[PDB]
């Protein structure tokens, strides 16, 4: 298709949902979304697979992990002629314990990248859509799962637009378990659909502290007006000011708080949040 | 339990030689294992004189003493940070110096700011270092460098150069854990003959400023190496107004200087009322 | 001063000496001592000393029994901090050994020579190329000059070539930075090919060219206008090397002709590979 075409066909506000062949979790959401939701199929294609379509939400679909793909938004432009309003990579979770989840969380690397992107780089955060997502699963959720953020990290990183990843964990029995599946597509569908209304209320923040899922943040987010984006757990502290100066500056929505668990928090790390908050004009927001 | 006015020796298990000194000093002087914890770790004590030990870098550490306030419930009176020095260079050494950074800051700290020095501490090192030193290394100052600079407290760097070897040499490791107590135990009574002095030229090692310290009264702070020159006076004034000691001079050497910076030197010594003292 | 160590040697008479020692004492950390050699004061950084002389180093054969009567020990390695001189104006940073192919006039003993330290020269010729900033010529010189009665491996590295050059701040700093580099470093590294170098004018280009371009590392080098020489001086300077001899190259159009064949004869005889440039 012509670019005059793509720019008639795709026009306005855009959200896309992104998949991978090679991702059971994913292909299960992605199944639920088709068979639940009113996609429908379309005339485009997105490196080499169908471009599914519901009003402004798209489903494209990858061949490979979704972590290496550094520049997608350049290759939404590129292939489809739009620059998405927002990507939602559908997504597992994987770990060696048995838990079993639904998370989200934002990428980006604090130290050196071993899952893709860039060393000490970020993905542009989108807190509202990560705290309705929370709420949203919290709701739907009926399996006894763990719902909760995950701290930042793999990639990619190198991406313009604002974008999330939304998880099932940890293992293939929870990836390809229906219910999760619809859980995921139902908070998608939500999220995707009141994002943009919704977040009048919220209080953006970035988080730090405590371990890899999380759990003073996830608490926070489930019970009052924090909106986290970047997440700075213990086992990625300490970090230095420049590394958290960038984080800073990689949210798609404006920063208005450093949120810090105390407890859960290096000293170093902790002291040098509260001076850049400070100096930066942010709320301190001190748990413990 | 920590009250009165505490020392504090800083160590962390990532360094070889902060370990090596750290392990001295308790072996050979009556410290204590406390009951209270730092970073997670022991805290140990010898009268007005405590070892903490942090995970990582000490280099990193701004707003160190706002975290022994806070995990200890006091304020330093000063703060000895035992470290490493590394080099490519088959350089054994025994060294003294500041945090600070005359320029951008590459291993912490802050851009063109500066840890409050402690000009006797040091002085008392070179001396003590150069009474016990049989190994037949350099006993030296080093150029102001390095974090962290966020400090509110009088602290110096004591370190082993330049590589593994030495980090972990047990004779290096007695002089300077008995080098720390020594200074500590008289750095506040035995400095009233010392003459509080910024440096400038000269490499990272300060050998001018190094002698005159070993031989006569002048105590440095803070010393600008010809490779960080040229600062801008603003920057100057801001060292000059990190001592933990009132300053009195500003030596140059001065063939060891750039001359915008040798000749800056010269005329704040004149405005701010401070000696000038030249070699060269 | 037991340990590897390393003498870096300076002479009060020289200008570029004493400008390499200050660089040296300013930069890398060097302590003063209590020991005295030629009544002066010894300087030290680790395994490393600056001895300094009071008269010019050229005539000090036998310079290693002293350093070890005087100081007690025997030395791995000397590095003699010098200047050049020429009136051919040349401004260049450069390192060459000692020794006299016919009449000694400048030190030393007639057809005798200093103990070569390839290696080191080979990193000395990196080195200041490296740092040359200055946009001077870098290079071996000839085996020229002594001392030459020295049993302890040495070099000469040098400024050259008038005193504008020899009090020459940078070149001062090149100098010492490369020496302390090549002494902490030129026991790692090897394998290179060492050889003795036949050919060419005073600054030895070719050799200098192959030296920097490859693997070769010279020894003694035995210019045009000392030659011709004969078997037994070749000889004689072929078992003055401080590392194995493994090829005689020959700058061939730099070479008479008799020392050319000479030397091609005599790779031959000794199982020595032969290197024929030009
Ligand atoms: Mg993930
Ligand atoms: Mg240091
Ligand atoms: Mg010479």
Same mark, same amino acid.
């Given at each position: 298709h012509s670019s005059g075409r793509e720019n008639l066909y795709f026009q306005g506000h855009m959200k896309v949902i992104m998949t991978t062949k090679v991702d059971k979790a994913s292909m299960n959401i992605m199944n639920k979304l088709i068979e639940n939701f009113g996609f429908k199929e379309t005339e485009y294609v997105f490196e080499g697979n169908p471009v599914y379509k519901r009003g402004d939400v798209l =489903?494209? @679909? @990858?061949?490979? *992990?979704?972590?290496?793909? #550094?520049?997608? #938004?350049?290759? =939404?432009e590129n292939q489809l002629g739009f620059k998405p309003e927002i990507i939602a990579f559908a997504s597992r979770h994987s770990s060696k314990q048995k838990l079993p989840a639904l998370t989200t969380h934002v990428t980006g690397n604090w130290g050196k990248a071993m899952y893709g992107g860039k060393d000490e780089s970020f993905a542009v955060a989108i807190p509202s859509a990560m705290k309705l997502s929370l709420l949203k699963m919290s709701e739907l959720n009926d399996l006894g799962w763990t719902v909760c953020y995950e701290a930042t990290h793999h990639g990619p990183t190198e991406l313009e637009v604002p974008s999330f990843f939304i998880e099932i964990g940890s293992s293939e029995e929870e +990836?390809?378990?229906?219910?999760?599946? *619809?859980?995921?597509?139902? @908070? =998608?569908?939500?999220?995707?659909?009141?994002?943009? %209304?919704?977040?009048? %209320?919220?209080?953006?923040?970035l988080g730090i502290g405590g371990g890899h899922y999380a759990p003073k943040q996830t608490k926070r987010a489930l019970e009052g007006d924090l909106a986290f984006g970047h997440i700075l757990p213990k086992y990625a502290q300490p970090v230095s000011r420049d590394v958290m100066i960038k984080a800073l500056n990689r949210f798609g929505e404006k920063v208005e708080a450093i949120?810090? #668990? +105390?407890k859960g928090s290096r000293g170093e790390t902790r002291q040098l949040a509260k001076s850049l908050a400070q100096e930066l004009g942010l709320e301190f927001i001190k748990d413990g």
């Amino acid at each position: 298709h012509s670019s005059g075409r793509e720019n008639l066909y795709f026009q306005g506000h855009m959200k896309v949902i992104m998949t991978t062949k090679v991702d059971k979790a994913s292909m299960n959401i992605m199944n639920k979304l088709i068979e639940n939701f009113g996609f429908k199929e379309t005339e485009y294609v997105f490196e080499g697979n169908p471009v599914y379509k519901r009003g402004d939400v798209l =489903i494209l @679909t @990858t061949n490979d *992990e979704m972590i290496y793909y #550094d520049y997608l #938004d350049r290759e =939404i432009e590129n292939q489809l002629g739009f620059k998405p309003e927002i990507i939602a990579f559908a997504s597992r979770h994987s770990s060696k314990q048995k838990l079993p989840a639904l998370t989200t969380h934002v990428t980006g690397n604090w130290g050196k990248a071993m899952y893709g992107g860039k060393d000490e780089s970020f993905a542009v955060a989108i807190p509202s859509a990560m705290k309705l997502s929370l709420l949203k699963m919290s709701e739907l959720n009926d399996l006894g799962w763990t719902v909760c953020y995950e701290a930042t990290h793999h990639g990619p990183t190198e991406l313009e637009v604002p974008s999330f990843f939304i998880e099932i964990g940890s293992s293939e029995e929870e +990836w390809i378990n229906d219910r999760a599946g *619809e859980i995921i597509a139902e @908070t =998608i569908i939500y999220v995707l659909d009141n994002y943009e %209304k919704g977040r009048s %209320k919220f209080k953006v923040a970035l988080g730090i502290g405590g371990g890899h899922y999380a759990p003073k943040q996830t608490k926070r987010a489930l019970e009052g007006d924090l909106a986290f984006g970047h997440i700075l757990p213990k086992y990625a502290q300490p970090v230095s000011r420049d590394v958290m100066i960038k984080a800073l500056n990689r949210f798609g929505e404006k920063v208005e708080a450093i949120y810090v #668990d +105390w407890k859960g928090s290096r000293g170093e790390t902790r002291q040098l949040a509260k001076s850049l908050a400070q100096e930066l004009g942010l709320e301190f927001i001190k748990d413990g």
